[PDB]
Amino acid sequence: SALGKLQDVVNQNAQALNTLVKQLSSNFGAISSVLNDILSRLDPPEAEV
């Protein structure tokens, strides 16, 4: 428990990277989270929306 500050910084950076990669795979109010299924199963207007 002595090496706390450096370990805390490393853990914070890892958690930030993980939550960023997780937010990339979010819906954000859409029907899915993948762009291919959206551009392939929707009409161009709703697709670009």
């Binding site: 009409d43 161009p44 207007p45 670009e48």
Partner: protein
């Protein structure tokens, strides 16, 4: 531009909205900064047979 279509095919002529006529005859992209005008012409363009 001028063309003759039926009733159900009028709504298909719109920016972004696809269908049967706006795929091989007259396609309108999502940049149409004109304005569609249309009216009924079943009094001088139709004939028996």
């Amino acid at each position: 531009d001028s063309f003759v279509i039926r009733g159900d095919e009028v709504r298909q002529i719109a920016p972004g909205q696809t269908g049967k006529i706006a795929d091989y005859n007259y396609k309108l992209p999502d940049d149409f900064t004109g304005c569609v005008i249309a009216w009924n012409s079943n009094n001088l363009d139709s004939k028996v047979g």
